[PDB]
């Protein structure tokens, strides 16, 4: 079966308009994947330890020590928006749809090829490449998710984003249990804190092998491998944002006095003394009904401690947060808090011809308003008694623990039974699409890395590896290290991801926000005179939705 | 039937998604119409003559003399985009659809009311208003289009554009035949040109009466009038523009030399001597194949004489043109040529609280590129022979007729059997929707005022009038002028216009142009502190389409 | 005209009108094109100057060909370089059938 | 039968000048070749096409 | 269409041929004011760039399904049936002067 | 522009922009690809329309 | 997915560690600290907590 193709290249997105404003989006994606034989045909338990860094007082957050099992397999990950949609498809979906549903997923591997490299080491000297017609490509599909879930989008290692650029898979590796202790300190700390890696707890040791837990297929040139169709189990993802705050929920106060002339300084007037008003409040001990005092249904968003690192049995880790935000976009300098930052390279959006090893990055700033402005928070004594007196207020300016740069807001947490919150928004093109749910008895209410989380069923990971091409001399009983003919493989990948979307409706008199090409961004969507390209990030929930 | 309503108020737009990316758009529009009794219950033949103006040499274009028949009826016109869609509906249609089809139209008149005004002329003195329960509102629907077609959008006189603002109909009047002669002149002209109104040609006289040619209904409070549904006869209207010029049609030249470094001055190079190239040309006498010389299929757009006034039996009139345009938008100062200019008032888009009698206006600048840049035109002798010599070129700089401000381009016309052209684009909210076809044997290939032209069938005009409320003293045999109780009427109007649209597809890698609200235009879509409003114009064909 | 010694009114002249009778373009052997695609404008040309046949609605689709990338053992998607690939070329036979 | 159009007329739009197209050319007693010009197509080709 | 630049398949059944590199036009604004030999100063000759509202970047991968053919493979287009008027192979010689 | 910079050379304008793709086109839309001189003579001499 | 080690040990040994081999502020991945370029094992983004 050498001279016969086993598949088709398809990278088209189809919209199929059903009934009742629901369309079916079929995203096809094909790619040529390049794969070299493993640097080692063995599994390894490698420890990483950068104590030299953290040894410097004040650097706890630069902790990198961990342990991982390095396997001789590669992972073919296509779980990122950029792998399926191009800028033009995203604009259509994001501008005209109101919500998204993830439906199916299926892959395929065809037109496999295995070449060999011979050192034509003559003068120059040289190199020769030849087909190894009887060689094999090993393929394993972990349908039962026996293996550790390792989504590549987290480290910018998924398949590439351009239909016409060959891509590659990533070396697979997973974490191995270890104990580590790191006591925090600051520049003025004395003596040496405590920074040790304790080793492994035998009761938490799990060494996984693909050979032992997954059936492997050997594909020769004439072979093809096709995953069946996987049908997802999820909630819909919204493509519209909310802008309401507790301050904009409900019936506003009745203005007994309205302006009578156009004018920036012509305001309306409630026209009633603040302690002589009517309405409901939750401050049982005052007569002041204010817009900051009046009672609202519940609470949109919450407060959490910031740049808080917690520690458990294997080192410090940052305390997660859902969303960030602020008022008049002090943007960028605005950033920080809980706005995701993505760093990527030449294959996932960075300008293709860019030299150097510095990645490209961006901080995604969502349209939703469900965050907090710490500088505006404050706490005061129940007696109320305005104007508040210094000993009766704790402002986000007063120090804590004596530290000049720490407030109570840094320690603060206002999550409770009244917290209303939104799931995470899609991030094009670098964001991950779906995630696997934690196998704990009590699960997170949402995942900070993907808008879709398969509870029960999640697609299995696909592993690939070039089978060993040994030379006439091979001795299993020797330390050496098997020597094998330099072999590599190229195969085509093809996936199909199906969504179900709901067409949007116009509910207000005014137009709304839409994604569009303009004089300014115009050149982020076309190649240059050298064929250089780049894929700029874009927002998903542009279009307000009322919350209450 | 006095205390019982005869209709419902509905001003909602519905999109009903059928099969195969085709949606059905139902636009409902309701309004409260106010109507006074006619200033005269008689038809009048009035002549307008402003010779004082045109008597001033050089003012021919300010000619206003005409003759019209002034009728005692009013017209209820709803043929303008603003009567059916609000900014939010337009953005949805314009951003997500690719073409429009006009399907039905139907109207209705309900909840009629007729009041009377009594001069409570006591001290202040005063006024009293009372219901005249037995009074009638006369309604006539000209289904067979017997009457002259007089679309109100041409003079900004259609129903209003805000669902919550009472509107009014316009006094109906039509043109009457007359002969007029006006000889052109300029500031330095001597003697007096010739500016006379000759009167009427008896063989062209047509005096129309609604009473004699249309059946009239008399509606009392308890009555309602409902037009059946009219189904249009038309072609589809496109919501995408073309950008290609003759210069961008076909296979571009093969570049034998491509850039090798990113850089504004790094150009490609055909790399072949101009008179040593291959391809086809229509200049049978040269060997130069240039991008301006190479042969193209036909010709996109044409040239016509500009600010050309022609004259026939009733005075001068401007020579019409389809579209205008230019390169790097020298915009506005760009304008002129054939870009429509709309002047309107408080009821159709002008800021509602604006004082004074000066209207609001705009020049619609289309996205399509099918116009000409006269400054770049030139004509040269067949011998060719470059560089062209002065006596062998006529530049749009060389004078004509000796006039320092006139070129050949002003006289120029290049319309022919190879002219490719586009129909006119929709103009929101002031543009007219449909038009009636000329009853000539050879019709225009398009109308410059509306994207839809019903050839065979066009909806009939609806006329309204308050029936005469006479006093105890009425004498038909006397010159006087009938005296009648001051009566007026208020009734609700309700229309339903149905379209059929085709959802758009994304055909390119790059995103495209979309209408959107931004920091700059944000306040054109919301009322102010006094309730002032305005309706800003918007473009319809934003989204390129390839022509060839 | 315009004072120019080498320009007439005929150079500016246009007599196209409602009475113009005209013929379509003639076939040119062997260099002439056979058919052409119609312009997607609302008002089309009465004829095309480059081909005697113009498919209004339906026109054959274009056929594109390309030699798929034959990479060497060294390929790095994340690098500026420019992929290096084994020098490959192709020869295939084409066969068409046009019926009149 | 036939019509008159401006000759060696170049018009301009948003992307540069282009020659005004014409349907057919011609003349009486074939002053042929020197006759040419007007609207008679000229074809330039190579070794593979003639 | 390649015939416009003399780039179609060859004309001899017994001579190997080749296809032409595909390329298409992209939108751009350019201004060139005409002049003649005696013109003074410098006319105006500038390339303004691209209008974002007319930008269309086409990729075959994204809009057309691609087939991969190995030696043992073949590709066959179905039959396309044209939509056109007939083409005449006879000329007219009459002028207004020879009508009637 | 070096060319058109020379007053009187407007018609030698070549400036344009094009997207260069990595694909090739197989075009057979020309009379010579289908008929040889002998076939053309037969069609042209004995037929009246095509 | 743990970080990709650009440098692996070559001898058995308690002090023979692997090495990410990339400057901390020149790495790729996702973080929730919108205002820094440091992608660390204590900084990198995890699904939840
Ligand atoms: Ca233990
Ligand atoms: Ca906001
Ligand atoms: Ca007469
Ligand atoms: Ca343009
Ligand atoms: Ca523009």
């Amino acid at each position: 079966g050498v001279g016969i193709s086993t598949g088709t290249f398809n990278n088209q997105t189809e919209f199929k308009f059903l009934e009742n404003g629901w369309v079916e989006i079929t995203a096809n994606s094909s790619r040529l994947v390049h794969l070299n034989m493993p640097e080692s045909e063995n599994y390894k338990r490698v420890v990483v330890n950068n104590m030299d860094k953290t040894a410097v007082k004040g650097n706890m957050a630069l902790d990198d020590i961990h342990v991982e099992i390095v396997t001789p397999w590669s992972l073919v990950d296509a779980n990122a928006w950029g792998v399926w949609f191009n800028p033009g498809d995203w604009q259509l979906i994001v501008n005209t749809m109101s919500e998204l549903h993830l439906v199916s997923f299926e892959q395929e591997i065809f037109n496999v090829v295995l070449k060999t490299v011979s050192e034509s080491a003559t003068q120059p000297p040289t190199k020769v490449y030849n087909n190894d017609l009887t060689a094999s490509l090993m393929v394993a599909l972990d349908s039962n998710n026996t293996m550790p879930f390792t989504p590549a989008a987290m480290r910018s290692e998924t398949l590439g984003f351009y239909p016409w650029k060959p891509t590659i898979p990533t070396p697979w590796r997973y974490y191995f249990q270890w104990d580590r202790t790191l006591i925090p300190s600051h520049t003025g700390t004395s003596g040496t804190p405590t920074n040790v890696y304790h080793g492994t707890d035998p009761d938490d040791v799990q060494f996984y092998t693909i050979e032992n837990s997954v059936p492997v297929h050997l594909l020769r040139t004439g072979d093809e491998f096709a995953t069946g169709t996987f049908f997802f189990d999820c909630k819909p993802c919204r493509l519209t944002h909310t802008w309401q705050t507790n301050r904009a929920l409900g019936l506003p106060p009745f203005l007994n006095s309205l302006p009578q002339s156009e004018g920036a300084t012509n305001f309306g007037d409630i026209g009633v003394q603040q302690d002589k008003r009517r309405g409901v409040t939750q401050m049982g001990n005052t007569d002041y009904i204010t817009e900051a005092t009046i009672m609202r249904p519940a609470e949109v968003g919450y407060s959490a401690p910031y740049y808080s690192f917690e520690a458990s049995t294997q080192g410090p880790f940052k305390t997660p947060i859902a969303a960030g935000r602020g008022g008049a976009q002090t943007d960028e300098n605005q950033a920080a808090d809980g706005d995701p930052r993505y760093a990527f390279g030449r294959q996932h959006g960075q300008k293709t011809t860019t030299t150097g090893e510095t990645p490209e990055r961006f901080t995604y700033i969502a349209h939703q308003d469900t965050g907090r402005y710490p500088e505006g928070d404050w706490i005061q004594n129940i007696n109320f008694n305005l104007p508040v007196t210094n000993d009766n207020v704790l402002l986000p300016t007063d120090p804590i623990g004596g530290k000049t740069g720490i407030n109570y807001t840094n320690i603060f947490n206002t999550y409770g039974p009244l917290t209303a919150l939104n799931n995470v928004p899609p991030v094009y093109p670098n964001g991950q699409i779906w995630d696997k749910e934690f196998d704990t008895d009590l699960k997170p209410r949402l995942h900070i890395n993907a808008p879709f989380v398969c509870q029960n069923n999640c697609p299995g990971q696909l592993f690939v590896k070039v089978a060993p091409n040994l030379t006439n001399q091979y001795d299993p009983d020797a330390s050496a290290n098997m020597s094998r003919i330099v072999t590599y493989s190229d195969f085509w990948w093809k996936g199909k991801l199906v969504f179900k979307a709901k067409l949007r409706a116009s509910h207000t008199w005014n137009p709304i926000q839409q994604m569009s090409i303009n004089v300014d961004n115009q050149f982020n969507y076309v190649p240059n005179n050298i064929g250089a390209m780049k894929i700029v990030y874009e927002k998903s929930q542009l279009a307000p939705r009322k919350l209450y």
Side-chain angles (χ1 to χ4, degrees), chain A:
Chain A
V2 332
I4 292 176
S5 291
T6 50
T8 273
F9 177 107
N10 185 7
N11 219 297
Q12 313 175 64
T13 288
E14 316 148 34
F15 290 69
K16 168 183 157 198
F17 306 90
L18 291 20
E19 272 319 310
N20 301 53
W22 277 90
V23 327
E24 176 183 62
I25 302 171
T26 301
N28 297 98
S29 171
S30 297
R31 220 126 298 184
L32 170 63
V33 186
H34 179 266
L35 180 74
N36 281 105
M37 52 184 219
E39 62 92 40
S40 176
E41 293 286 338
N42 297 153
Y43 288 80
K44 310 175 176 184
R45 183 169 99 261
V46 185
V47 177
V48 170
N49 178 154
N50 73 328
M51 275 163 35
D52 48 74
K53 250 301 176 312
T54 45
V56 172
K57 302 170 188 177
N59 284 343
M60 318 85 94
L62 302 181
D63 188 44
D64 270 339
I65 142 178
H66 68 285
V67 180
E68 66 181 64
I69 291 291
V70 176
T71 82
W73 292 79
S74 294
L75 180 77
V76 177
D77 204 79
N79 191 351
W81 294 101
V83 177
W84 309 89
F85 303 98
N86 62 22
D89 298 323
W90 195 252
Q91 175 189 48
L92 181 61
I93 295 173
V94 129
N95 281 13
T96 85
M97 310 298 172
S98 73
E99 76 183 54
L100 218 56
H101 297 245
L102 194 44
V103 179
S104 313
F105 179 43
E106 66 194 79
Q107 316 175 75
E108 187 184 297
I109 286 187
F110 57 105
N111 279 233
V112 170
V113 163
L114 287 123
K115 289 179 179 290
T116 262
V117 185
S118 44
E119 189 59 342
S120 175
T122 162
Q123 3 284 56
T126 348
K127 259 189 174 182
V128 202
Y129 306 96
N130 311 77
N131 287 306
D132 194 317
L133 297 183
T134 58
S136 301
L137 173 69
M138 305 200 274
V139 180
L141 190 254
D142 179 44
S143 302
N144 303 170
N145 287 293
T146 296
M147 243 71 294
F149 195 64
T150 60
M154 176 207 245
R155 319 213 89 112
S156 183
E157 283 180 41
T158 55
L159 253 26
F161 296 171
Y162 306 93
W164 60 90
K165 183 181 190 177
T167 189
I168 60 176
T170 40
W172 193 57
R173 64 271 178 179
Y174 54 91
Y175 286 116
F176 188 86
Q177 200 285 315
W178 80 90
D179 288 332
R180 192 297 171 82
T181 286
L182 173 59
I183 300 296
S185 67
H186 63 67
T187 276
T189 289
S190 62
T192 79
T194 275
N195 173 358
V196 334
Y197 158 77
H198 302 111
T200 305
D201 179 348
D203 308 303
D204 302 326
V205 172
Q206 308 193 94
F207 168 42
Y208 293 109
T209 291
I210 285 183
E211 291 75 13
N212 300 80
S213 50
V214 184
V216 179
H217 276 57
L218 306 174
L219 315 184
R220 283 184 166 174
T221 310
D223 299 314
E224 181 213 40
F225 170 81
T227 276
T229 292
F230 174 95
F231 291 95
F232 291 93
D233 49 334
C234 310
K235 309 167 178 170
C237 170
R238 312 185 81 167
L239 294 170
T240 71
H241 72 273
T242 62
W243 61 265
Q244 273 158 292
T245 276
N246 266 222
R247 286 287 293 265
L249 299 175
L251 180 68
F254 179 77
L255 308 186
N256 285 100
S257 171
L258 296 175
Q260 287 192 290
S261 316
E262 318 187 74
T265 297
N266 291 163
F267 302 119
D269 184 13
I270 288 170
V272 181
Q273 186 175 301
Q274 277 176 159
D275 55 66
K276 301 262 167 172
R277 294 173 178 176
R278 303 178 332 207
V280 185
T281 263
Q282 190 165 50
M283 306 187 82
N285 61 169
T286 46
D287 295 339
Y288 286 129
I289 301 180
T290 279
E291 278 289 293
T293 284
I294 228 281
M295 179 177 80
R296 309 291 177 178
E299 161 154 39
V300 179
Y302 70 101
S303 288
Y306 51 113
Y307 277 11
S308 165
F309 292 72
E310 284 164 286
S312 193
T313 68
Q314 28 213 46
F317 61 77
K318 199 225 155 195
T319 294
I321 214 293
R325 235 274 140 60
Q329 263 315 296
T330 58
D331 190 293
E332 159 185 68
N333 291 196
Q334 176 115 35
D337 277 285
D339 309 88
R341 181 117 169 115
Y342 289 75
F344 43 95
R346 237 62 62 55
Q347 189 163 33
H348 310 295
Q350 177 173 203
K351 190 198 208 180
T352 277
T353 56
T354 281
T355 349
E357 328 224 60
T358 310
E360 169 75 275
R361 40 208 156 198
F362 70 85
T363 297
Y364 187 88
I365 302 179
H367 283 299
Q368 81 190 340
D369 290 325
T370 53
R372 292 299 137 100
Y373 181 54
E375 290 82 332
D377 296 354
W378 85 83
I379 277 178
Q380 52 177 299
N381 186 295
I382 29 172
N383 294 314
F384 225 26
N385 285 326
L386 316 177
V388 66
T389 269
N390 181 53
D391 273 321
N392 293 122
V393 238
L394 189 63
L395 290 63
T397 274
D398 308 309
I400 283 297
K403 303 310 183 73
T404 264
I406 303 299
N407 316 305
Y408 76 98
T409 51
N410 280 107
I411 312 307
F412 211 42
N413 184 330
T414 55
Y415 179 69
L418 296 165
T419 297
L421 196 68
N422 287 313
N423 180 201
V424 114
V427 172
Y428 182 84
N430 304 282
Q432 173 173 158
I433 301 179
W434 66 81
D435 200 30
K436 197 191 72 185
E437 183 55 277
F438 283 11
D439 185 32
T440 53
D441 308 320
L442 309 194
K443 342 248 175 180
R445 295 183 70 185
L446 81 159
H447 278 209
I448 226 56
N449 63 145
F452 296 110
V453 173
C454 353
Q455 226 294 197
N456 304 294
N457 49 273
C458 252
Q461 320 195 86
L462 181 67
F463 303 99
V464 169
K465 173 190 169 194
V466 170
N469 216 190
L470 310 168
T471 68
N472 65 306
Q473 323 184 70
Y474 175 71
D475 182 15
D477 304 288
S479 314
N481 267 327
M482 84 179 89
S483 53
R484 60 248 159 98
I485 298 160
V486 171
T487 307
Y488 67 95
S489 167
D490 297 323
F491 54 92
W492 298 73
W493 173 81
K494 187 186 183 175
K496 190 183 193 175
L497 190 63
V498 182
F499 293 86
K500 184 144 303 169
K502 170 75 163 178
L503 293 182
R504 80 177 188 80
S506 163
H507 278 106
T508 57
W509 170 282
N510 59 94
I512 228 126
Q513 185 190 182
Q514 303 282 69
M515 167 179 163
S516 171
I517 194 176
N518 58 58
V519 185
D520 308 287
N521 60 212
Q522 164 178 43
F523 295 112
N524 292 166
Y525 311 108
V526 172
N528 70 182
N529 71 332
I530 286 179
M533 278 280 277
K534 89 195 290 185
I535 299 179
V536 166
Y537 96 94
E538 256 120 348
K539 297 169 181 171
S540 54
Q541 315 173 325
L542 56 204
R545 135 165 65 100
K546 79 188 172 70
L547 180 169
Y548 182 75

